[PDB]
Write a protein that binds this ligand. Structure first.
Ligand code: ALF
Ligand SMILES: [Mg+2]
Length: 209
């Protein structure tokens, strides 16, 4: 029983939604933020700068509204069944995201994931301050996290799998044993071993040892 590890990106992969675009709707800036999110996922913008820019537009948004947005996030088709089978096949399952703990940790709890890494929205007096902080901002951040988790678990990098859809998943792919682009952007598909174009996470299972 050689241990294995699979890491999932969150927005548009493990869940249907883009967390930040949902929150942007509550702040009345959905269109503006969605445009930046798309450019960042296409690899046209630096991730950290793009995230800080989007989060500044959310300044003063009440936490009550952030929560309403988060309540709308739903797991991607086949997420539960895929996670179950992955655990049956002996995998440690993790979610690594450039999104936010308040949304990611809910799903980590709901789906029973082993690890969850995300950034943090800063709040004061019940409202967003417009700032974000975290360790999933730099270009190489996700790759470093994959290595960190694998090291803790004593899992060889060759026995790791990464599933993602955007440009900030590139460093995660770089360190992964098997790279799966799930209904992904061109910049990521070019770096993938396997490209899945049907939106059902169960489609990755046929490729998993
Ligand atoms: F959850 Al992501 F880029 F979609 F970190
Ligand atoms: Mg994504």
């Amino acid at each position: 029983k050689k241990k294995k590890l699979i890491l999932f990106d969150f927005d548009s992969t493990l869940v249907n939604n883009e967390t930040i675009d949902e929150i942007a709707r509550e702040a009345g800036v959905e269109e503006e933020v969605k445009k930046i999110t798309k450019e960042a996922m296409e690899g046209k913008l630096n991730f950290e700068q793009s995230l800080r820019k989007r989060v500044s537009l959310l300044k003063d948004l009440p936490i009550e509204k952030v929560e309403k947005a988060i309540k709308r996030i739903t797991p991607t088709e086949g997420a539960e069944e895929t996670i179950k089978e992955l655990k049956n096949r002996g995998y440690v399952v993790a979610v690594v995201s450039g999104g936010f703990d308040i949304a990611v940790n809910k799903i980590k709890e709901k789906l029973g994931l082993d690890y969850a890494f995300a950034n943090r929205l800063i709040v004061k007096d019940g409202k967003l301050t417009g700032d974000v902080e975290g360790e999933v901002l730099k270009e190489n951040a996700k790759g470093e996290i994959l290595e960190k988790i694998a090291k803790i678990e004593g899992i060889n990098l060759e026995d790791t799998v990464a599933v993602g859809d955007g440009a900030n998943d590139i460093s995660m792919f770089k360190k992964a044993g098997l790279k799966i682009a799930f209904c992904a952007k061109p910049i990521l598909k070019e770096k993938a071993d396997i490209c899945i174009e049907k939106r059902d996470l169960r489609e990755i299972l046929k490729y998993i040892k």
